[PDB]
Amino acid sequence: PDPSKPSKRSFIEDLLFNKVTKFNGLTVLPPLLTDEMIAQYTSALLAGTITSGWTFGAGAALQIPFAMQMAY
Amino acid sequence: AYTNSFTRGVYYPDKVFRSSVLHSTQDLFLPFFSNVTWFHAIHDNPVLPFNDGVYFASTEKSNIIRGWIFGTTLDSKTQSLLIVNNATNVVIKVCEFQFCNDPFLGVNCTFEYVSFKNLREFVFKNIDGYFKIYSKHTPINLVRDLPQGFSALEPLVDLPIGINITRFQTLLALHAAYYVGYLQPRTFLLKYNENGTITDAVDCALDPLSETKCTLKSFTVEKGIYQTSNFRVQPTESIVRFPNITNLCPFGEVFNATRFASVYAWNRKRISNCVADYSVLYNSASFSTFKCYGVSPTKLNDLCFTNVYADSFVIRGDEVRQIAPGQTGKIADYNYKLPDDFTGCVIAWNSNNLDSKGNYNYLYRKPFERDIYFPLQSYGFQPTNVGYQPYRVVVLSFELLHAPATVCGPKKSTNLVKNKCVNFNFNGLTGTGVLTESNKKFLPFQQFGRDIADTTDAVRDPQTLEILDITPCSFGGVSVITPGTNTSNQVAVL
Amino acid sequence: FELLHAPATVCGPKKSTNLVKNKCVNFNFNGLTGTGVLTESNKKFLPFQQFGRDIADTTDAVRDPQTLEILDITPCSFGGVSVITPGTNTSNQVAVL
Amino acid sequence: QNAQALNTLVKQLSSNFGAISSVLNDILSRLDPPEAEVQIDRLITGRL
Ligand SMILES: *[C@@H]1O[C@H](CO)[C@@H](O)[C@H](O)[C@H]1NC(C)=O
Numbered sequence: 001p002d003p004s005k006p007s008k009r010s011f012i013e014d015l016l017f018n019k020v021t022k023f024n025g026l027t028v029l030p031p032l033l034t035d036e037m038i039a040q041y042t043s044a045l046l047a048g049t050i051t052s053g054w055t056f057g058a059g060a061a062l063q064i065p066f067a068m069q070m071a072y
Numbered sequence: 073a074y075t076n077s078f079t080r081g082v083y084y085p086d087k088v089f090r091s092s093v094l095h096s097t098q099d100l101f102l103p104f105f106s107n108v109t110w111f112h113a114i115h116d117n118p119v120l121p122f123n124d125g126v127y128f129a130s131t132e133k134s135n136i137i138r139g140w141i142f143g144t145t146l147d148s149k150t151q152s153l154l155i156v157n158n159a160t161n162v163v164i165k166v167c168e169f170q171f172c173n174d175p176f177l178g179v180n181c182t183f184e185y186v187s188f189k190n191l192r193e194f195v196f197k198n199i200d201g202y203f204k205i206y207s208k209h210t211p212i213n214l215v216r217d218l219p220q221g222f223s224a225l226e227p228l229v230d231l232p233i234g235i236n237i238t239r240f241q242t243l244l245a246l247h248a249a250y251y252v253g254y255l256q257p258r259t260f261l262l263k264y265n266e267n268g269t270i271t272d273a274v275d276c277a278l279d280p281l282s283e284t285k286c287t288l289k290s291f292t293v294e295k296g297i298y299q300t301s302n303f304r305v306q307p308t309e310s311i312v313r314f315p316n317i318t319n320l321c322p323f324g325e326v327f328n329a330t331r332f333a334s335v336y337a338w339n340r341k342r343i344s345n346c347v348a349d350y351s352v353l354y355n356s357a358s359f360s361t362f363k364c365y366g367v368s369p370t371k372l373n374d375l376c377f378t379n380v381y382a383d384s385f386v387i388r389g390d391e392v393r394q395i396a397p398g399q400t401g402k403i404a405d406y407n408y409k410l411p412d413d414f415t416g417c418v419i420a421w422n423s424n425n426l427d428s429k430g431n432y433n434y435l436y437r438k439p440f441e442r443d444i445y446f447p448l449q450s451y452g453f454q455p456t457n458v459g460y461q462p463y464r465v466v467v468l469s470f471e472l473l474h475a476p477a478t479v480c481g482p483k484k485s486t487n488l489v490k491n492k493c494v495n496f497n498f499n500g501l502t503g504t505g506v507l508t509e510s511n512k513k514f515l516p517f518q519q520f521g522r523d524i525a526d527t528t529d530a531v532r533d534p535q536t537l538e539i540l541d542i543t544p545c546s547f548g549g550v551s552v553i554t555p556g557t558n559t560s561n562q563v564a565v566l
Numbered sequence: 567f568e569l570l571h572a573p574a575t576v577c578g579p580k581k582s583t584n585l586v587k588n589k590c591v592n593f594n595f596n597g598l599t600g601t602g603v604l605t606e607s608n609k610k611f612l613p614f615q616q617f618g619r620d621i622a623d624t625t626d627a628v629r630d631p632q633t634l635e636i637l638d639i640t641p642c643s644f645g646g647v648s649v650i651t652p653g654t655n656t657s658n659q660v661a662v663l
Numbered sequence: 664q665n666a667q668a669l670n671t672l673v674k675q676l677s678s679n680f681g682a683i684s685s686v687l688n689d690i691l692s693r694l695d696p697p698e699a700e701v702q703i704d705r706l707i708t709g710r711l
């Protein structure tokens with residue numbers, strides 16, 4: 001995530017969002033999870049993946065040096 | 073004085089048996105928790121409106137209330153339904169009764185019949201001339217007001233009186249409070265039990281949880297959010313716009329013409345830049361026929377046209393039937409053809425007392441074609457010839473294409489109101505929405521704009537040539553956020 | 567003419583027949599027809615009710631117009647047939663469900 | 664695909680389906696109920 005943005009999305013996520021683009025009883029409902037909330041979930045999944053490998057999936061997020069994580 | 077109707081004033085709506093079912097019905101019921109007028113009989117028998125119908129209820133300890141009067145004037149000038157219960161004999165009459173200045177009971181007829189501790193509930197409604205009576209008697213122990221609770225009323229009587237009832241009055245026995253509540257077209261959900269007795273009810277338009285019970289067909293509602301309705305804003309007033317022209321259309325010059333043309337060479341007169349009052353032609357009894365294939369003849373007063381053409385000629389009486397879309401024959405095919413998509417009205421009357429003599433000036437031989445051993449034949453019309461008599465026929469062809477309307481009927485315009493939800497009519501084109509100023513540059517020949525759905529997008533005001541945008545008044549789904557009814561009856565609305 | 571399902575006061579010149587219970591029969595009650603088994607019932611119709619109805623708006627029960635008792639209408643037993651067959655190439659014998 | 668589905672649905676409102684007009688108000692403003700109902704049923708069937 002980029003802290004300088006109005007919505008804390010990563011550089012790559014912004015690229016993705018910038019590429020994908022009545023009165024007759026037809027309306028559109030909003031999603032329950034807003035783009036900001038989705039960004040928070042992908043951020044959590046990413047932060048977990050980077051700092052704790054797969055341990056956060058099974059149980060607690062257990063810190064591990066990234067280089068060691070790669071060794072596994 | 074007023075009281076709370078609560079859950080009283082529901083009746084078995086039909087002679088259909090049901091049980092263990094949450095059935096739903098629309099009929100003239102008393103709306104739940106609405107106010108009913110409370111009258112007293114101590115130390116009060118006014119005339120009340122009947123409106124669309126009445127729930128009546130009374131509380132007794134000594135049988136003071138013994139009857140009812142229904143009618144418009146209740147003074148021997150009209151027929152008035154009278155119901156009286158004296159000791160053990162119920163009496164029903166519908167005579168033109170002479171009632172007292174103040175009717176009471178001391179301690180040209182078309183129908184006659186002869187047979188607090190007590191609550192006696194009744195329902196009166198007057199549907200296509202039928203006076204339908206439902207009632208229920210139940211023991212009570214309450215003096216102050218109507219008891220709270222539920223128990224439905226059976227139908228007992230249905231009198232085909234044919235009386236126009238607008239007012240009613242009660243009859244008291246003088247040496248017992250009563251209530252009058254107006255019925256309304258409210259849909260209900262009704263809990264028929266195992267015995268088939270309605271044991272609970274939910275008025276649909278009471279509150280958003282009641283809408284949710286009406287939508288789910290259930291007296292119990294689970295925790296969630298439910299799309300019970302669509303909220304749509306209503307209009308306030310209507311807006312009627314037509315070109316402010318006072319010229320009248322020369323129909324007299326067509327229908328009362330000295331001479332009609334022959335069918336081989338029929339005339340076509342253009343009617344434009346005028347007010348067309350079609351009530352005169354329709355109401356006139358002089359016509360043998362006035363048959364419309366395009367639009368109904370009574371709508372012609374509101375509706376208006378880009379042009380109207382009057383096709384005027386003489387035919388033989390039995391041939392009147394051939395002047396219609398979809399018809400074929402020696403006249404329909406050879407001398408006077410209409411489009412099979414023809415829009416308009418064919419008007420005809422005999423001229424046996426005008427053109428007939430013999431009169432040999434009438435000759436006969438694509439749609440609207442004028443075709444000016446020969447194919448040419450003629451009639452000798454004589455006053456002694458019905459199917460062989462001459463008829464004067466005028467066909468009125470109406471062009472309803474959406475374009476500037478030159479022929480608009482006798483209807484007054486109103487002022488135009490902007491930025492408010494309104495019911496509009498522009499040159500016969502109607503709809504509901506918000507009229508606003510616009511920046512849509514209509515070309516001088518354009519009168520209406522359209523959207524993808526072919527609905528009207530914008531219009532040009534026919535009196536002042538400015539463009540108004542039409543945006544439908546704000547609307548959207550309602551939804552009712554509710555915990556389970558096991559936890560609460562409180563709800564929130566989206 | 568008022569044809570609403572309610573007790574019929576005006577009925578034309580047609581003779582009635584005897585009523586047979588617990589058998590599949592073609593019935594006509596005051597002009598209302600159908601086919602099924604008429605049985606005794608415990609459905610307490612109110613005095614003003616003449617016909618009962620099911621969810622499908624079909625008749626559930628009726629009040630006999632001559633003797634005011636309630637008869638239940640249950641359609642006569644029915645179901646899919648199915649033919650159990652080893653292929654004709656194997657044999658022309660079959661069994662029926 | 665979803666935009667196309669909605670655009671198709673809206674465009675269908677312009678169809679007559681055998682009626683004299685796709686515009687419901689134009690049927691009602693021109694015909695009495697005994698005839699208007701027939702034209703409307705044609706639109707209801709098509710729109711439904
Ligand atoms: C009923 O009457 C009371 C006054 O006693 C008033 O406040 C209330 O708004 C009225 N309700 C309705 C639905 O008319």
Ligand SMILES: *[C@@H]1O[C@H](CO)[C@@H](O)[C@H](O)[C@H]1NC(C)=O
Nearest residue numbers: 092264265266267268269271
């Ligand atoms: C139905 O009536 C019976 C009495 O016949 C009564 O006991 C019962 O509580 C009533 N309610 C039902 C079962 O619908």
